[PDB]
Amino acid sequence: AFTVTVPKDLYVVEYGSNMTIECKFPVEKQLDLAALIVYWEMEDKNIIQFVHGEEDLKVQHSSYRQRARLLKDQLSLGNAALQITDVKLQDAGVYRCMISYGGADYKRITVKVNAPYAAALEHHH
């Protein structure tokens, strides 16, 4: 029974930092990239789409353009690792990793973004 697992449901992130949120999936022996699909999104806005070896950007949101990448190395360890650079308050919310690999599942991750007044005022207006 194919189960995606998350070591951390919740990340607390400082504005301007970078984060890597992780989804684990079973890999017996060596990853077959041709059978792997990974979607990452937040609030039905798309971040990563990894179909049989390559990312696509085809339904990606601009807010994440040039800021998000999936660590390909980690896939062969069974780790779907999403790195977001230069975290913005807009990045707070609920992420989903959807994984299809001879079986399919998905998990939610909640991200909380702390920021000081200057950053928060800009976001507010």
Add this chain to the structure above:
Amino acid sequence: AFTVTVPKDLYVVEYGSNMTIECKFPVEKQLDLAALIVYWEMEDKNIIQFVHGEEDLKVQHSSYRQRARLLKDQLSLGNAALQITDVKLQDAGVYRCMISYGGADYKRITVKVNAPYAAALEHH
């Protein structure tokens, strides 16, 4: 590549009525149940978990128990098709059909529920 499509992404349903919301996915010749996974949910509540031929009857969310089922005959046609009976105001919201079949994709469907005053409470 593999695309789930929704001809109709908006349903307007009457309280107490029935609805059938549909997602299409391509089938080449004969359907292969072993490769097929169909998952249906609404704003993070499980409705249908159909894995390699078998509906998992015991994982359905309580508020949908005995009201929701996947029309298995429609899969042979490349139509997921979630049939919901005795529609409640709680049924309004965004549904998702997630489909894996030699490829994977998902789509959103919005449901609105019309209801008379008495039903609308609810509300308390």
